[PDB]
Amino acid sequence: ASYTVKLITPDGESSIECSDDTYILDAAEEAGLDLPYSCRAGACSTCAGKITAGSVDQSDQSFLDDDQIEAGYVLTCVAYPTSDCTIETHKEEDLY
Ligand SMILES: [Ga+3]
Secondary structure, three states: OOEEEEEEEOOEEEEEEEOOOOOHHHHHHHHOOOOOOOOOOOOOOOOEEEOOOOOOOOOOOOOOOOHHHHHOEEEHHHOOOOOOEEEEOOOOOOOO
């Protein structure tokens, strides 16, 4: 049951469909979104995306702790958008 996943970017606004048992990144790169990712597995902050218009599940990540997720930075390389959401890519520098 894929849901409308809004991927905000400085080069425009796209909308990819991601499943609950899939990663927002894979669904993005698969379409050609070309998001800021490196490990694309779940062990960084470059894939993190400021979220504040939906919900996701990142119980596989190994970078964030509690303050990061609180802000909204969700690793797209390991996020499970159970429902519609609006991940704001290009939001990792906040940490570094
Ligand atoms: Ga990553």
